[PDB]
Amino acid sequence: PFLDALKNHVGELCGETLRLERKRFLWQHQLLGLLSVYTRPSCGPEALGHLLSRARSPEELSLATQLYAGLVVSLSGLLPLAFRSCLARVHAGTLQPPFTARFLRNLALLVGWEQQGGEGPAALGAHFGESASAHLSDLAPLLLHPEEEVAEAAASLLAICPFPSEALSPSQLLGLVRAGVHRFFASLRLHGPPGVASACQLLTRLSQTSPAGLKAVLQLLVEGALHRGNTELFGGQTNRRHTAAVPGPGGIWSVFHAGVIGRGLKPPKFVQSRNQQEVIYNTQSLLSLLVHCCSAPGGTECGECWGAPILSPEAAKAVAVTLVESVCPDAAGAELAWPPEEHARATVERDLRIGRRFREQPLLFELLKLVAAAPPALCYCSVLLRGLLAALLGHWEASRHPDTTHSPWHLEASCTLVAVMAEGSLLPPALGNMHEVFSQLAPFEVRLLLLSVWGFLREHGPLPQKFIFQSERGRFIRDFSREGGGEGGPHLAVLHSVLHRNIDRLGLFSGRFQAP
Amino acid sequence: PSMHICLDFIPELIAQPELEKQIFAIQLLSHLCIQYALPKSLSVARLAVNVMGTLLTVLTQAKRYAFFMPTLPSLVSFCRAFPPLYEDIMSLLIQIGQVCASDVATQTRDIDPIITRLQGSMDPDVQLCHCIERTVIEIINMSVSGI
Amino acid sequence: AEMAPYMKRLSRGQTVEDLLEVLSDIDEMSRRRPEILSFFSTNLQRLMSSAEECCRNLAFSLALRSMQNSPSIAAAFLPTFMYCLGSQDFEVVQTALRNLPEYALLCQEHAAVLLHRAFLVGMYGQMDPSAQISEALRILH
Amino acid sequence: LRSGNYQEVIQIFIEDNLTLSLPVQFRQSVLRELFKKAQQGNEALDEICFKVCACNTVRDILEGRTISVQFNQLFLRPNKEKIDFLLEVCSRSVNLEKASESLKGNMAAFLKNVCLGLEDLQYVFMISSHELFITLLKDEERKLLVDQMRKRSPRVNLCIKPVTSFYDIPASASVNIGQLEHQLILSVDPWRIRQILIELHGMTSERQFWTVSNKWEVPSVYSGVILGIKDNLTRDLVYILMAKGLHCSTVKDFSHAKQLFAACLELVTEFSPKLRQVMLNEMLLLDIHTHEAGTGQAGERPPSDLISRVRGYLEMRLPDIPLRQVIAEECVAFMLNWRENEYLTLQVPAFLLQSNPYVKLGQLLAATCKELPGPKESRRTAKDLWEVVVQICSVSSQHKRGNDGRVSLIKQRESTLGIMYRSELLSFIKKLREPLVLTIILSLFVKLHNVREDIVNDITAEHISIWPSSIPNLQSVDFEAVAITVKELVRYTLSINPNNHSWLIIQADIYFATNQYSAALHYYLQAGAVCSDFFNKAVPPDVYTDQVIKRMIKCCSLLNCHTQVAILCQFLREIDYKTAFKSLQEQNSHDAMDSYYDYIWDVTILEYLTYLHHKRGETDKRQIAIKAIGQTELNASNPEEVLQLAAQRRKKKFLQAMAKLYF
């Protein structure tokens, strides 16, 4: 009768034990263990769940471990039952947000302790991570929990929670990745760089599971980063009164005006000037996450300690394709071979919208640099570059100013375009040097120069071929001078003619090009 | 006290093309039904729900938001007035809820309310879904405490 | 004491045939003195999320009989029932949706959360709980 | 650069980090050229490239522009040397006296976030200890960041041993015995168990003490032999050892179970050979369990020594030792899962092989699976498997003497003529994890299900349909039990690995037959997303055959999504405009009828849509349809190079959104 009577008060006994008396807690721990061994359901999951729910310190966690050690020799499979019961209760109205956050962080400590060490977990074989992998699915919504503490605890737990024998089902992977990206952006919104480490680690650990996982992670992440929301974080964007004064001041006559054209006086005229600073750092955080995801670990430790790991051409491919679809879903000019210059005339409108999107969102330049890191991805990212070049060409023509620096942003955009192409290796280094001199040039000079660039690239169409793989280094190489045309030749002649006509202020720079 | 007459011409009012006029008509009918509970009032409240169902089919999303956000809180009033006119209310509410949910996925979102299933200035559709959730909470509460 | 073997059979059960036998027998002597079922409260829960139509139907029948006898046990089945609704097998959820009105009726306290969760599941997963919700709320008046 | 004094170049760069004379674009181009040199194969320049990149990054941070990706790539795995060089570069780059608060905060924040990026606590400590870092960052922020990094420390000590509240030397023999037996139960070491039990026997009478923890269990088959020992001490020791080790095996604690069972082995060796032979059977079972679990499901190669042991043990069967069906079936499953087709029926074909049905069925399965590579249309082993399974599932008595209803098999589990019962073969299969045999048996079972089990002829897709069509004793078989078992096996194989489009299609067809349309679409989308990387590539039609897409049309139409049905229509080789129009006609849409007009990419269906909207008087959507048609991307007159790309892109977008919606 005593055991059966205390069955209804098992939980309060756990609370008394957690109160950490002198020896009453030991006595109640023993009582709980014996009662659990006694009753047929064994109330083991219930006692363990309550203990963890009100657990907040390592001594209580150790009490829980001691109870598990005492019970495991007698019973089996307590962890699945406890996890199911506790998670179901959390989903139900019970387990107040502090309690559930405490439980999640205690579980995080348990899984971390099991992952580390060689004696404690070895003696106590529980496999918290293995059991939790069975419930990875229902943990994902806890990431979007309205309560910041709950979200933090869940993210920390899943940052190290392992995965089942099979990697994961596609639906579960999609749920996890979507939750992770949303959590990542919310964390950037609230905490900033310091607070996103857990989510970044989660995304990384689930990225290298399967290639489809890499594709999904990159696609969702970049698309979200470019979404209307969360983009200012990176780049930035009655009758009473009417009759209280009326009647044309005449009263016995009509009113002056004959109507209104609409609402009138669009009020806002509002500018985005939140802060230039630390947007760089947020972009750096996102860029680091992308670098981690795309860069295959390799493990070879290239060089002694200097050789950086090479980036995945497949990851760069995915980023390029998703960026293309995000910016311009158009595919009319998808022929990777560059059409002639006149063809841009029909495509101006699309070119202009692409240019506007770029001017609005500077982050695209950094993504372009990331893609340039990989050799072959640019060949796929061909339409964006064509559009940007068409926009810059069109704009430069309608420049009446004798100086080029008068239009600030366009100059920087042109310089970045040329430098990115050079780094992407679709240009010889001679033309890569090109971007240095744009500042000290008349507009038509730069326009003809970029026309020459267009001609050269038209001759040398960027294609996946000619990117020769190297066994020594995974980075694919495009060997110049083997394409027949080789160097700029006729186009380098135009470049030389320009610099030689403008020796007035370009003499110092002329020493770069030398003889190609 | 001499405003009950509106139940005469509200049927004529709803027929007007202007979405503004229709939104106003339903809102007015909400409070009239609470204050007066008469067979005519119910015979018009039914037509209100039928018209909302019709406009659900015939309205693009840009106006669907502008026409459903400020009129949905009207439905709890109908439920308060008329327990008989209840299953139709719930059918329309679930229909609009899942049509909005389906529209949500079409274009990437930053909150993705789908995962909220197991539970500022946001996008219109997210606002609409949150509105429907609030209305369902409210109708459940009013039915629980309505005796 | 006389029931001692039955919960042991259930706990040590892992096969559909044996579990179905034990459940059928349990129903047989539940028909007389159904109050004995109070010792199976835990037994029915973890079986509730199974993947067999017959087992789940028996679990529902026993749970609702136990509730009809002892209404004070709703909180015990609340979390497991909520988990059944939340599960994504599209079978347990369907059955729980079918038998939602009776459980909410016997609860009278947490209908606020029950019907909310049912409606959310209906909205996002393409199932129409309109009929069940309408019946439950009409009965609640 | 012409000469090769890259060290002088680096010095000039660090001096420019203060002078600010050089062009930043010049620096960037120089860095690109040096990295080209490094790519050419000059590894010595790698560290030089790193140093110049660090100089460029620090220079840029002064102005506050974005950080180059290449710096992070090089910074993926920093060493002490890299961090020290960066610190020293910063030290020269900034002079505290002639520096503004803006620049000071810039460097402070940059170093703060670099540390946030760091992982190694040693690097954290050194970067914090750098004198410039200390000067720039106030101690409060420094300590806050230090606490933040060290908050990633799981260094918590947990007590593993259970607490023993009983105090030693109680001055009472009864409570002393109680504490001693409590320690015995808690103990796991066989030697300590022996010591405790022998002490108990010594300080008590000759009373059996194995009945001290009722939780302990012993199979009734071996109970007689285990307790049939004259010496109470030895029988209790062996009983407790075997019971505890079996419990450990059940809990999957092979580490301690091995120790306990090995200790029991030596004790039993002095006793009769029968007991030690049973204990060797326990060795074989525990070894199989440890191999399957501890080495993991990814065990690359079994040592095959225990495989030879199992081979001999099965083939010998000489003595009257009580053998367990668990052991027999587990080892047969082990060999089958490891593909020991060499040990086919030819080996030990008749010696007790027919007596034990497990080995018989396993060898037949091996023969029939190796029969598939053979192109000969013999399928004799397949026919044998078909006959044995159909007889197993068939009711022994067609006239149903036991009961009028056909529930004997479902409840009484009798009238089950065959080598196994349905439950027995279910246990056997769940012990399997070999994809090939598993999929072959699933094909057999789904065939048995689909052969005239009901009115509907929704034949489920299957890869190798070689089983006989003829079905003798069709009345005897139970389509209901067939459905239950096939669903169970599908649930088991999905648990094995969801990444199997072949099983996903089967599961989805099962749900479609059951009219669980939501689940059907859910799993079909999972199948497509497994076959292709979440639709980033073109879906192979071999999986999304026209039959599957037709199933999708039916599911969607019954699910009341009459625009999604139209979108799906295009996926066929020939578009079913009849069903497209018949679906668009009705007014009961539930699928955001307007927003989806973007994805539809066939001009004719949009023409139908425009006509319908104009006729029914819905201008707000008529205009959307007109715009969609007017879009230039699609014109039905392009050279089709662009049309196919556009259709592919729209398919990707639609299927991606559709997958997001469900699950």
UniProtKB/Swiss-Prot annotation, chain A:
Its main location: nucleus. Component of the integrator complex, a multiprotein complex that terminates RNA polymerase II (Pol II) transcription in the promoter-proximal region of genes. This is Integrator complex subunit 5. The chain crosses the membrane at residues 63-83, 363-383, 437-457. GO terms for biological process: regulation of transcription elongation by RNA polymerase II; RNA polymerase II transcription initiation surveillance; snRNA 3'-end processing; snRNA processing. Keywords: Acetylation, Cytoplasm, Membrane, Nucleus, Phosphoprotein, Transmembrane, Transmembrane helix. Belongs to the Integrator subunit 5 family. One of its GO terms (cellular component) is cytosol. It comes from the Eukaryota. It is found in: Nucleus; Cytoplasm; Nucleus membrane. Coiled coil: none annotated. Component of the Integrator complex, composed of core subunits INTS1, INTS2, INTS3, INTS4, INTS5, INTS6, INTS7, INTS8, INTS9/RC74, INTS10, INTS11/CPSF3L, INTS12, INTS13, INTS14 and INTS15. The core complex associates with protein phosphatase 2A subunits PPP2CA and PPP2R1A, to form the Integrator-PP2A (INTAC) complex. It is a multi-pass membrane protein. The chain holds residues 472 to 1009 of 1019 of the full protein. It comes from Homo sapiens (Human).
UniProtKB/Swiss-Prot annotation, chain B:
Belongs to the Integrator subunit 2 family. This is Integrator complex subunit 2. It is found in: Nucleus; Nucleus membrane; Cytoplasm. Component of the integrator complex, a multiprotein complex that terminates RNA polymerase II (Pol II) transcription in the promoter-proximal region of genes. It comes from the Eukaryota. Component of the Integrator complex, composed of core subunits INTS1, INTS2, INTS3, INTS4, INTS5, INTS6, INTS7, INTS8, INTS9/RC74, INTS10, INTS11/CPSF3L, INTS12, INTS13, INTS14 and INTS15. The core complex associates with protein phosphatase 2A subunits PPP2CA and PPP2R1A, to form the Integrator-PP2A (INTAC) complex. It comes from Homo sapiens (Human).
Curated annotation (Swiss-Prot), chain C:
The lineage of its organism: Eukaryota, Metazoa, Chordata, Craniata, Vertebrata. It comes from the Eukaryota. The chain holds residues 2045 to 2185 of 2190 of the full protein. It is found in: Nucleus; Nucleus membrane. Changing residue 120 to P: In NDCAGF; uncertain significance. It is linked to Neurodevelopmental disorder with cataracts, poor growth, and dysmorphic facies: An autosomal recessive neurodevelopmental disorder characterized by severe global developmental delay with motor impairment, cognitive delays, absent or severely limited speech, dysmorphic features, hypotonia and cataracts. This is Integrator complex subunit 1. Component of the Integrator complex, composed of core subunits INTS1, INTS2, INTS3, INTS4, INTS5, INTS6, INTS7, INTS8, INTS9/RC74, INTS10, INTS11/CPSF3L, INTS12, INTS13, INTS14 and INTS15. The core complex associates with protein phosphatase 2A subunits PPP2CA and PPP2R1A, to form the Integrator-PP2A (INTAC) complex. Interacts with ESRRB, ESRRB is not a core component of the Integrator complex and this association is a bridge for the interaction with the multiprotein complex Integrator; attracts the transcriptional machinery. Disulfide bonds: none annotated. It comes from Homo sapiens. Belongs to the Integrator subunit 1 family. The gene is INTS1. Component of the integrator complex, a multiprotein complex that terminates RNA polymerase II (Pol II) transcription in the promoter-proximal region of genes.
From Swiss-Prot, chain D:
Keywords: Chromosome, Disease variant, Intellectual disability, Nucleus, Phosphoprotein, Repeat, TPR repeat. It is found in: Nucleus; Chromosome. GO terms for biological process: protein localization to chromatin; regulation of transcription elongation by RNA polymerase II; RNA polymerase II transcription initiation surveillance; snRNA 3'-end processing; snRNA processing. The keyword rRNA-binding does not apply. TPR repeats lie at residues 1-24, 238-271, 501-534. One of its GO terms (cellular component) is nucleoplasm. The WFEF motif is required for the recruitment of protein phosphatase 2A (PP2A) to transcription pause-release checkpoint. Belongs to the Integrator subunit 8 family. Component of the Integrator complex, composed of core subunits INTS1, INTS2, INTS3, INTS4, INTS5, INTS6, INTS7, INTS8, INTS9/RC74, INTS10, INTS11/CPSF3L, INTS12, INTS13, INTS14 and INTS15. The core complex associates with protein phosphatase 2A subunits PPP2CA and PPP2R1A, to form the Integrator-PP2A (INTAC) complex. Component of the integrator complex, a multiprotein complex that terminates RNA polymerase II (Pol II) transcription in the promoter-proximal region of genes. This is Integrator complex subunit 8. The gene is INTS8. The chain holds residues 333 to 995 of 995 of the full protein.
